Design a protein around this ligand. Structure first.
Ligand SMILES: Nc1ncnc2c1ncn2[C@@H]1O[C@H](CSCC[C@H](N)C(=O)O)[C@@H](O)[C@H]1O
Ligand SMILES: [Zn+2]
Ligand SMILES: [Zn+2]
Ligand SMILES: [Zn+2]
Ligand SMILES: [Zn+2]
Length: 270
């Protein structure tokens, strides 16, 4: 295949070295199950979408901000008047509560503030934007390959990370698993095989503990938005992070049965 000249030790140290180059809280590597040293060594970690030819990026002439200024950004207690929330229904509220966690009544769409807005980067409505906050750990699972788990307790509503990768068209997808359509608002797709984030290793579960929230900050066509993972159950340290691929991430582009321990596992094929 490749990287045959590198020993088990050499491979593991180079991946751990790649992880330390990531910005933000630490990301660690662990394997107590078998002898695979690490995931692919040519994989590249990124912090924002990598666009490809064919992708029409957003037009900044459609961008709108909000007037709030104040002392420390927008005010959770005055959800009205903040223009970023106008798209919401009559009892308008920010997606986030006082603790910084997504609210229980929040829908599938989170409207955040932009660079056009007048609020600072400490605005309460820039949670997804400020990025990951939990230390994560890539580890080898028993029957699912690699997976991710948290080292700190993550109550429900805690932001975890975003799904990143190459943004590509249907055509580019045809020429070429890991495909994650941007189908919330109705042809761009996210391919995380060569470029992506830690979330590239999140495994599937039929009773998951994290879910996807479509975070929108652009006021143009909603062809590109953030795929934000939030906890929907409480997550104890070392608990594997899993979400429901169905409707979101593809199971395939002679299969393999699902191996989640849920008592209601429906039994998908990969
Ligand atoms: N509940 C699950 N049951 C069985 N296989 C799973 C699974 N969740 C993920 N997988 C496997 O991992 C793939 C999703 S991508 C991430 C898988 C893992 N992080 C790795 O790279 O080794 C699937 O195609 C499947 O082969
Ligand atoms: Zn505002
Ligand atoms: Zn705003
Ligand atoms: Zn704001
Ligand atoms: Zn299952």
């Amino acid at each position: 295949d490749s990287y045959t000249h590198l020993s088990f030790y050499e491979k593991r140290e180079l991946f751990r070295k790649k992880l330390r180059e990531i910005e933000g809280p630490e990301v660690t590597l662990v394997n107590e199950v078998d002898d695979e040293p690490c995931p692919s060594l040519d994989f590249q970690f990124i912090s924002q979408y990598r666009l490809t030819q064919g992708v029409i990026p957003p037009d900044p002439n459609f961008q709108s901000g909000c007037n709030c200024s104040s002392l420390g950004g927008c005010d959770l207690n005055n959800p009205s008047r903040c223009e970023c929330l106008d798209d919401l229904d009559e009892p308008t509220h920010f997606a986030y509560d006082a603790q910084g966690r997504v609210r229980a009544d929040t829908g599938a769409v989170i409207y955040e503030c932009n660079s056009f807005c007048s609020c600072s980067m400490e605005c309460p409505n820039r949670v997804v934007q400020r990025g990951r906050t939990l230390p994560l750990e890539i580890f080898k699972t028993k029957e699912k390959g690699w997976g991710v788990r948290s080292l700190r307790f993550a109550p429900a509503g805690t932001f975890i990370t975003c799904y990143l990768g190459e943004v590509i068209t249907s055509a580019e997808a045809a020429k070429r698993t890991y495909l994650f359509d941007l189908d919330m608002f109705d042809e761009y797709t996210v391919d995380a095989q060569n470029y992506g984030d830690v979330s590239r290793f999140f495994n599937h579960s039929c009773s998951p503990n994290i879910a996807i929230y479509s975070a929108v900050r652009n006021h143009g066509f909603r062809t590109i938005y953030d795929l934000a993972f939030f906890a929907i159950k409480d997550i104890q340290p070392l608990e594997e992070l899993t979400f429901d691929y169905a409707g979101a991430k593809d199971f395939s582009p002679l299969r393999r049965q699902c191996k989640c321990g849920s008592a209601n596992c429906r039994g998908w094929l990969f």
